[PDB]
From a paper:
NA is a homotetrameric transmembrane glycoprotein responsible for cleavage of sialic acid from the host cell membrane. By blocking NA enzymatic activity, neuraminidase inhibitors (NAIs) prevent new viral particles from being released from the surface of an infected cell, thus stopping the spread of virus in the airways. In this study, we applied a set of experimental techniques using recombinant NA variants to understand the molecular basis of development of oseltamivir resistance in the viral N1 neuraminidase NA2009. To decipher the structural mechanism of resistance, we determined crystal structures of NA2009 mutants in complex with oseltamivir carboxylate.
Author numbering:
A (entry chain A), B (entry chain B), C (entry chain A), D (entry chain B): 82 to 468
Write the structure that this text describes.
Amino acid sequence: SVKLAGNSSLCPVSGWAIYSKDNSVRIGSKGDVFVIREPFISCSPLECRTFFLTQGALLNDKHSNGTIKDRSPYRTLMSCPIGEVPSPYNSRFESVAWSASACHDGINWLTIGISGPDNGAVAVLKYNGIITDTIKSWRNNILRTQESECACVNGSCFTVMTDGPNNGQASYKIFRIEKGKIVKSVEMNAPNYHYEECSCYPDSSEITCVCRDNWHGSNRPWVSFNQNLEYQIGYICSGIFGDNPRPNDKTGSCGPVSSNGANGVKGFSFKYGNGVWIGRTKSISSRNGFEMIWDPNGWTGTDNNFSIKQDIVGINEWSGYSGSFVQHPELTGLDCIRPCFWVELIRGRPKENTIWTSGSSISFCGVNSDTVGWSWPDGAELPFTID
Amino acid sequence: SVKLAGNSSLCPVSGWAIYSKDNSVRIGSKGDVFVIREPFISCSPLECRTFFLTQGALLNDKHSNGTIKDRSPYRTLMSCPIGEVPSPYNSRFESVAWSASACHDGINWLTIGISGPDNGAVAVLKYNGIITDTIKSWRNNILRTQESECACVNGSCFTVMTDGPNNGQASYKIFRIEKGKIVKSVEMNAPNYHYEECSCYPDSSEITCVCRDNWHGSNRPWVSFNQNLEYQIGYICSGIFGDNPRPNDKTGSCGPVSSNGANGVKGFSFKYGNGVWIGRTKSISSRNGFEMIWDPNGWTGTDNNFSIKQDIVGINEWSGYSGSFVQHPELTGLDCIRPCFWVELIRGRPKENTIWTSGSSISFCGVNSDTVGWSWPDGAELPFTID
Amino acid sequence: SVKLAGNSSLCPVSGWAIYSKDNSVRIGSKGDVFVIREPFISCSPLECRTFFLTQGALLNDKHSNGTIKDRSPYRTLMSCPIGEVPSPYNSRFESVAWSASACHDGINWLTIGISGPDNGAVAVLKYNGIITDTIKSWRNNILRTQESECACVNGSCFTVMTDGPNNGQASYKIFRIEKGKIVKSVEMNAPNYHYEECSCYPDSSEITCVCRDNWHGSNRPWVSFNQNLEYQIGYICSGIFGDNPRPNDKTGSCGPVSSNGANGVKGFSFKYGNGVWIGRTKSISSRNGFEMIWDPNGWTGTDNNFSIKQDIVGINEWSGYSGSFVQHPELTGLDCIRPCFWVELIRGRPKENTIWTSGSSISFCGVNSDTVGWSWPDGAELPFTID
Amino acid sequence: SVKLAGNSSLCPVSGWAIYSKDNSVRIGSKGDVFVIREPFISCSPLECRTFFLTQGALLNDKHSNGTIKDRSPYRTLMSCPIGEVPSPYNSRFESVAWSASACHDGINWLTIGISGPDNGAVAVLKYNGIITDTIKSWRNNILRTQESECACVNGSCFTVMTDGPNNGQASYKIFRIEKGKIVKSVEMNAPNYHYEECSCYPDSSEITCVCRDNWHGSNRPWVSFNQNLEYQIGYICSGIFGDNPRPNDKTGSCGPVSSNGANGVKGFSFKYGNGVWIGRTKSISSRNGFEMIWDPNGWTGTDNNFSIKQDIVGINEWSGYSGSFVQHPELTGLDCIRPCFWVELIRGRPKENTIWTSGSSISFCGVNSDTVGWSWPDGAELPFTID
Ligand SMILES: *[C@@H]1O[C@H](CO)[C@@H](O[C@@H]2O[C@H](CO)[C@@H](O[C@@H]3O[C@H](CO)[C@@H](O)[C@H](O[C@H]4O[C@H](CO)[C@@H](O)[C@H](O)[C@@H]4O)[C@@H]3O)[C@H](O)[C@H]2NC(C)=O)[C@H](O)[C@H]1NC(C)=O
Ligand SMILES: *[C@@H]1O[C@H](CO)[C@@H](O[C@@H]2O[C@H](CO)[C@@H](O[C@@H]3O[C@H](CO)[C@@H](O)[C@H](O[C@H]4O[C@H](CO)[C@@H](O)[C@H](O)[C@@H]4O)[C@@H]3O)[C@H](O)[C@H]2NC(C)=O)[C@H](O)[C@H]1NC(C)=O
Ligand SMILES: CCC(CC)O[C@@H]1C=C(C(=O)O)C[C@H](N)[C@H]1NC(C)=O
Ligand SMILES: CCC(CC)O[C@@H]1C=C(C(=O)O)C[C@H](N)[C@H]1NC(C)=O
Ligand SMILES: CCC(CC)O[C@@H]1C=C(C(=O)O)C[C@H](N)[C@H]1NC(C)=O
Ligand SMILES: CCC(CC)O[C@@H]1C=C(C(=O)O)C[C@H](N)[C@H]1NC(C)=O
Ligand SMILES: *[C@@H]1O[C@H](CO)[C@@H](O)[C@H](O)[C@H]1NC(C)=O
Ligand SMILES: *[C@@H]1O[C@H](CO)[C@@H](O)[C@H](O)[C@H]1NC(C)=O
Ligand SMILES: *[C@@H]1O[C@H](CO)[C@@H](O)[C@H](O)[C@H]1NC(C)=O
Ligand SMILES: *[C@@H]1O[C@H](CO)[C@@H](O)[C@H](O)[C@H]1NC(C)=O
Ligand SMILES: *[C@@H]1O[C@H](CO)[C@@H](O)[C@H](O)[C@H]1NC(C)=O
Ligand SMILES: *[C@@H]1O[C@H](CO)[C@@H](O)[C@H](O)[C@H]1NC(C)=O
Ligand SMILES: *[C@@H]1O[C@H](CO)[C@@H](O)[C@H](O)[C@H]1NC(C)=O
Ligand SMILES: *[C@@H]1O[C@H](CO)[C@@H](O)[C@H](O)[C@H]1NC(C)=O
Ligand SMILES: [Ca+2]
Ligand SMILES: [Ca+2]
Ligand SMILES: [Ca+2]
Ligand SMILES: [Ca+2]
Ligand SMILES: [Ca+2]
Ligand SMILES: [Ca+2]
Ligand SMILES: [Ca+2]
Ligand SMILES: [Ca+2]
Ligand SMILES: [Ca+2]
């Protein structure tokens, strides 16, 4: 039982091999499956788990009514084994939460679950299931976090939280956590940037996060930092815009791209020097489809050329959030940190005529062997009996 | 594998961080969730479990009919992991019981489950799931116990049991138990006192219990004792009255407060010198709302002044029983015993137009970091299909 | 990990403390609970399990139709933790079977499951879940076994099987089994005796079985034997008759009591020298009620006097099969083998107007501390939705 | 924790003892049971598991509609303990797949799950749940594999895959896999042969596979090979034809038997010198009944004589796929590899008037002790509520 080192580089990847699919919404038509959104995957040295925010209700029951609503006292962070449906009969209780993050340092699970009122929310940090720290809203305006895994390097785990407007300048802080206790934090000095829902991973002892600008950017902002929280900030420069909504691909910017910049979706990308692996929706205007694109100069260069595209979900099918996750060498036995990703397939409101909103999930792992594009969509037939 | 020492003091706490919420009644609208009441939490050195008294029936099924009834041969003590719904598919069987207690000494679980007729009930003690002792009613009038966790100190666990009227003078005994065997007991000499449903915890090698006077007290009675069962008794002196029902706050007493004193609700409080942390309903007349109040002189002083109030459940929402539980240093790695508490959110009869009565639960742990008041209510929409 | 010794004597017991209740039929009204009959309890050095014969169907589903029928290719022997309902979601698969036995030698589980046609049935023996032996019908007329636990002493386990008529002279064999392999067997020379459904236990290195005479006895036959299968046979002499049906209590016999002797119910008794602890129905004519009676001279003496009766299930409530089980000192830490028992509470056909037949269960352990009589019946309201 | 040697011979068997029956379809009428087909069994040194291809849907739910369809993005490989129903509450997620294989090398599980489009499908290999390799379609025409267990010998596991037409000459490759990585492969040079759905087992350090000719053979093709993938090929010569459909028994061939040769069913056989144990349907024209036949010269001789037949499923009852599985000496403690087999009992479309297709399963292990013929059919009553 040993701390993850986090000191090897990301593995080189040519393509993405399908890892899991839970079919949660299809199964929940009959079975006892939680209404969920904001799922994410995180791994220990022994296993991979799906974390998710329940709505304290099951699919196809009357208590799923009104689950478009983001924040309530009923929402809880729970987890289950990867690829299994999230049920009351197979899910571990983690925290009371309407925003969350989680990660394993090699020894125990850290979970961060935020609840409370919009004007004074509190993040509750747990290590091995025991409360180890709290942090309260510092701008009194919806303290919130990643909705994907935190990142760990040599016994320290790292996350980003936001507090303030979702449609204007807000406040962004980076945290270093050891055994569930906050040991350091810093406010990012990012005037004119907007960071929401960061997808962070370790690479060569440093953390890279690719986030959502909900204010005025259709490209994604990034922040990277070392273990002392010395950071750098920027936006992905590629004209292959990564947010949803966005414009058609054209010449990009290393600052926020204003065209179609308001609103957004949680997402991710993996940096390889000047290059980038971008996961994005297929539709420029809606949460539909998903694809992976390799742009060899897209981290720093503004053209809209790219070299590989792999289809994940077809343009006519519902998608949603996505996030990164990694598998450390302590799990895989490889000599590098393996990049992986998950996609939330959102069903229900606002786009479909149901009383509820819920998601299923798919995930993929990066490989250098042969792969293929396809579409692996949610597959449920809506509406349901309850609607 | 080592016995809990129980020799450190209670941790100092400024406020309460949310720890769990099971949403049992919401989920049970569709899922297979036991009808339960009298839930409580207790921890080992490895995990925290919810114990509860089933009615041998599931929510939204005809066998939930008439579950306002307290004692039957169908009620069982069972347990599940904290925060999970109590289902037949995730719950461990403990004992046949219509009143119960349980606690872990560091090595194994002790459960105490009382069943049989009102005029001759028998407590069955189990250690590691094996029957180790029994004790039979000594006044032939509903032998009954805590409905929350027993308290353990250096291999010995301690509980309190009552036998006799619920509306006049009864008989109260303290027990010391080792490996599931009663090794000592004493009858408390408490004329004019009434003790029901004690919430007991360890603090510096001694046990303190805060209980319910169902006869003629709207403040709570207490009993404290050492390992040889040498005890002291009194009532909480604060004019911040702890029971439900109760009068509006005014000058208190350190005997039983007769105004609104008949009837009651199980509750708890934590003593810190002359001060007290009081958990109570918000309503003076019904089991609605919940709040935590820090009164720095409330154990021994009679004024109705207090320094901190933290909201837990809104005044218009259903609450119910509450109890203490602790997390020992052997679980947390701290240097003190961490006080925590649970609240039962009772749904159905007598206050709502259903055929059934059941509860869900919430819990909190004491911290010295930032916290916030809110309302985390049950959230089910009654009546149900079966009603 | 060590073989059970089986060499200490049965513990002296004054009365019976309630150990489990599963409420299976009440829960199965909504939940996913197997239709079962012929349940029984057996323990390892670490835990106690409920074994049972499913009908390959769930309660309140159409496939429960016709489950009065004893033998089919759908019946399977499965097991779950004691006191939990038998569900597809918590039950371990053991064997394909319409008659069964099971026991733990201290190292692994032995299961014996008989299936096949009436004219050529085969017992499949499994040790640690792996097929270790078979034995085929030797009279071609419903090879059948205990429906309760086998008995183990120093690495050998022992059982009894019958083949031939249920209403006349049949053939009875005793088996010694080591690591799932039959190492010895003998045919009992018992002209004019009838043995069905033996309840066997260890006591001081020897096995005692108390069985059902379905031909012409309203008292119970017994067989006892050592590890070399040197046996003795008799009938319980007490005028406190043990079978169902039976006459009113009167002077008994050490041979089969012909009055009301045909038909029967599986049951048990525990021998203490000349004395006996008898479990029986309360009704002389029907499977209703249950009671424990201590008759200090009832093993060898024919009077109808007895000294203790303890009520278990009221005379107006449904009962059914019962059987012995033991808890070895390797489990309990005691210096003797603890006698325990279980009762099957049969619901449905033939006595009630349902399409199905199923049972729930209760169990008790022998103690020398205080106990009480009561009634702990099944408690389901019949008929069900499906009927 | 040690690799399976795989160097002992197959155990001699006189007959087949029933090992498991899951009753999945019966139970799924009410319970939450996956729609599945292509089940198979495989064992580790500690346990036996059922693997299966879900349709991402539950029985008696609308999403079971159209499950006659073989390949979709919703199908997943999952596994549960042998004999238990495949539910979302007891099943481990393995891979996204519409064709699969799995096997344990003594240390960890290998799973192979093929998904993607018909013209470019990709097999994802996982070792201990971690992606270790991929292989992509080489003829762009439904890359596909065994639907039963792979075979392991001294740390290397072996499988066969087909790519190309199901009704004419296709391409067949053998693979050697170590810790989930392909280390060797070879294309079989088998003009005029057709290999689908191979049932492979180890015997004396070499692998033998018995497969389905879907093009023009009513007898079964075989391939056998050593660890360096040096192979031999032929067809089972017995006039006791093994496929379904097939002609009535008559003089056979050791090439493909053209009469009734098109189409087929997955099956198996076990070679013992010149002899063979053949599992087959009872019907020559449809997937009904099942029987085991010992033909002492049937591997290499063409007559239609045989020595032993054991009934498994009656001629009027539904059967389906069948496959081999083995129990190694490391699991059993025997000195030889124990042959066992499973049968899929297919319910629904095309033969029955439902919207869905699913199966249940039975399994048997080879013994030299007494056995018996019977019928252990599926037993569900179709149609269901949803139909
Ligand atoms: C939960 O429990 C409640 C309480 O038992 C139950 O509600 C009751 O349902 C029964 C059956 O519908 C009702 O009983 C009837 O009452 C009427 C008068 O109101 C009588 O006329 C009926 O008696 C006639 O019918 C019987 C059978 O045919 C005859 O035996 C009898 O002699 C009469 O001819 C019968 O007593 C009862 O009124 C209600 N009570 C209330 C308060 O609603 C409820 O249905 C249960 N729910 C579930 C889901 O279990
Ligand atoms: C399982 O799948 C089957 C196959 O899809 C499904 O059975 C089908 O149900 C649908 C809906 O009831 C039927 O479709 C209708 O067919 C009639 C003629 O028979 C048409 O007139 C209907 O079209 C009208 O209505 C539509 C909606 O209002 C309009 O969009 C349309 O333009 C028309 O006005 C409609 O197409 C279909 O006939 C059956 N098919 C069969 C073979 O039974 C079944 O219900 C599914 N079951 C479950 C549980 O999912
Ligand atoms: C409050 C800002 C935040 C990020 C833009 O909105 C999120 C957007 C969401 C969305 O765009 O789907 C759903 C999230 N559950 C919500 N987060 C919270 C904490 O309410
Ligand atoms: C019998 C006295 C006792 C304490 C006042 O009543 C309790 C009150 C209850 C209550 O006030 O809600 C419910 C408890 N289940 C009941 N206890 C038992 C054993 O019946
Ligand atoms: C076949 C004789 C046997 C013992 C008398 O009948 C049993 C009686 C039964 C009974 O009296 O309830 C139910 C048992 N399931 C049945 N056993 C079998 C194997 O069918
Ligand atoms: C595609 C050829 C293949 C072997 C003949 O067809 C199989 C026949 C089937 C069958 O005959 O029942 C069902 C299998 N699920 C299918 N395999 C796939 C991958 O689709
Ligand atoms: C990474 O950390 C490991 C584990 O402590 C260390 O042994 C090794 O030198 C480092 N790897 C590099 C520099 O690639
Ligand atoms: C959904 O909730 C709203 C608000 O309480 C209510 O008015 C409506 O009837 C509900 N609908 C259903 C179908 O449950
Ligand atoms: C990792 O942290 C430990 C603290 O246990 C520290 O002593 C060590 O130097 C760190 N290692 C690296 C490679 O930074
Ligand atoms: C508490 O008990 C521990 C464990 O035995 C002991 O080592 C320690 O001295 C005790 N401390 C006090 C202050 O009693
Ligand atoms: C019982 O067997 C034990 C275990 O081997 C042995 O040590 C002991 O002598 C025996 N007990 C008796 C005779 O009571
Ligand atoms: C019970 O089974 C019989 C025999 O198949 C059948 O005729 C009857 O309709 C069934 N009844 C129900 C209610 O399922
Ligand atoms: C128990 O059986 C063993 C076989 O391992 C034998 O050698 C030993 O003598 C037996 N002990 C008793 C007490 O009979
Ligand atoms: C089989 O392999 C085992 C395990 O390595 C070895 O000890 C044994 O000699 C082998 N036997 C034969 C006959 O190859
Ligand atoms: Ca944006
Ligand atoms: Ca570019
Ligand atoms: Ca009171
Ligand atoms: Ca005060
Ligand atoms: Ca259900
Ligand atoms: Ca009889
Ligand atoms: Ca007598
Ligand atoms: Ca063919
Ligand atoms: Ca032949």
